[PDB]
C-alpha cells in the first residue's frame, strides 16, 4: 500500500504545514500538523475543556463506530517550544492520503496550553519520530507509520514541503518526479528517539564551504533551523545591522535586508537554502526589524534541522530494519 497527502502552510510565513487525515467511521477530517520530532498522534476531541477550544475542528470518539476507549491509558507531553497536552486514548481507523491503518492510538486532549488553542488551524499532531518516545501509559502505543509500515509497498515515508505553497507527504514510495538529481542517504542514530543525523557542513551565501560534524535532528514540526551558537554567528555576520535581542529572543535583522543563502552538507552533497526561505517577517505587526529563520540551539540541548531547512529538499525517512535519511535538492 502507499499514501500521498498535500500539507499546506497554516500562514504566510510557513509557521506550520497542516495535513488532513480522516479518524473514525464515518470519516471525521482533522488538520494535523506531522512532526518527525514526535511519536503522539493527538487531537483536539469532544474531551477538550471547552475553554481551551478556539476554532479547531474536534474528533467524537461517540460519534464513530470503529472507536474503542483503550481502557486506562493516559498520555502527557511538553514540546521544545513549552506548549503541551493530555488526556486519554482511543483507538480508531485513522487514513492518510488514502493508506489506512485500523487500531491506530488516536490521543484525546482533555487539556492543551494557550499556544495549541490559540492556533484555530492546527487541529493536533500526527507524531513520525520513533515509537520508543510515545508518551502513553502505562502501555506505550505505535506511531501511524510504525503501524503502516508492513503494508507499506517500500518501509518509507517522504517529506517534500513548500515554500510559501503546499507540499506532499508520501508513505511506501519515492517520487522519482518530486526532485533533482540523486538522492544522498546519511546514517541515523535512533539512540534519542529522533530522525538524529550528522550534517557534514556548512557554507554562507558565496562563501567557502566549512568542513564540521553538526549532529541533529530533521523535525518537521519545528519552523526554524537551530544551529550551534558559532554557526549562526557566521551567518548572520553577513547580513548588515543584524543582531542577537535578548528582548525579541533571537537574532533579528532589518527588513531592508537581502538575506545570504545558506548551504548545509549531507555527506559530499549540498542542499541551498534561498536567503528568502530565512525570512520571518516584522517580529510586530508593523516592525521594521525582521526575525531571522536561522536562531542558536545554545540552550536547547539539540541542533535542529527544521522547516526552514527541509522545505529546501526533497526528504526521504528511511524506516528499514538500519533506518536512514536521503536529502535531495528539488
Ligand atoms: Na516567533
Do not use: M
Request: proline share 4%.
Amino acid at each position: 500500500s502507499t499514501g500521498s497527502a498535500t500539507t499546506t502552510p497554516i500562514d504566510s510565513l510557513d509557521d506550520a504545514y497542516i495535513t488532513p487525515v480522516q479518524i473514525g467511521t464515518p470519516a471525521q477530517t482533522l488538520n494535523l500538523d506531522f512532526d518527525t520530532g514526535s511519536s503522539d498522534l493527538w487531537v483536539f476531541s469532544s474531551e477538550t475543556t471547552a475553554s481551551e477550544v478556539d476554532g479547531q475542528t474536534i474528533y467524537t470518539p461517540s460519534k464513530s463506530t470503529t472507536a474503542k476507549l483503550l481502557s486506562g491509558a493516559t498520555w502527557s507531553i511538553s514540546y521544545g517550544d513549552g506548549s503541551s497536552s493530555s488526556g486519554d486514548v482511543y483507538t480508531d481507523t485513522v487514513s492518510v492520503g488514502g493508506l489506512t491503518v485500523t487500531g491506530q492510538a488516536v490521543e484525546s486532549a482533555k487539556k492543551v496550553s494557550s499556544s495549541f488553542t490559540e492556533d484555530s488551524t492546527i487541529d493536533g499532531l500526527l507524531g513520525l519520530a520513533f515509537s520508543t518516545l510515545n508518551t502513553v501509559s502505562p502501555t506505550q502505543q505505535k506511531t501511524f507509520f510504525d503501524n503502516a509500515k508492513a503494508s507499506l509497498d517500500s518501509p518509507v515515508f517522504t517529506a517534500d514541503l513548500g515554500y510559501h505553497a503546499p507540499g506532499t507527504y508520501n508513505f511506501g514510495f519515492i517520487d522519482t518526479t518530486a526532485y533533482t538529481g540523486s538522492i544522498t542517504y546519511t546514517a541515523v542514530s535512533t539512540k534519542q528517539g529522533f530522525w538524529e543525523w550528522t550534517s557534514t557542513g556548512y557554507a554562507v551565501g558565496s562563501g567557502t564551504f566549512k568542513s564540521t560534524s553538526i549532529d541533529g535532528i530533521a523535525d518537521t514540526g519545528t519552523t526554524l533551523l537551530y544551529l550551534p551558537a558559532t554557526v549562526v554567528s557566521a551567518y548572520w555576520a553577513q547580513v548588515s545591522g543584524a543582531k542577537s535581542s535578548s528582548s525579541v529572543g533571537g537574532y533579528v535583522f532589518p527588513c531592508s535586508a537581502t538575506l545570504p543563502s545558506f548551504t548545509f552538507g549531507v555527506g559530499s552533497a549540498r542542499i541551498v537554502i534561498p536567503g528568502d526561505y530565512i525570512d520571518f517577517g516584522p517580529i510586530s505587526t508593523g516592525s521594521s526589524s525582521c526575525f531571522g529563520g536561522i536562531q542558536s540551539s545554545a540552550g536547547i540541548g539539540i541542533n535542529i534541522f527544521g522547516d526552514v531547512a527541509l522545505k529546501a529538499a526533497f526528504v526521504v525517512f528511511n524506516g528499514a530494519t538500519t533506518p536512514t535519511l536521503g536529502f535531495a535538492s528539488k
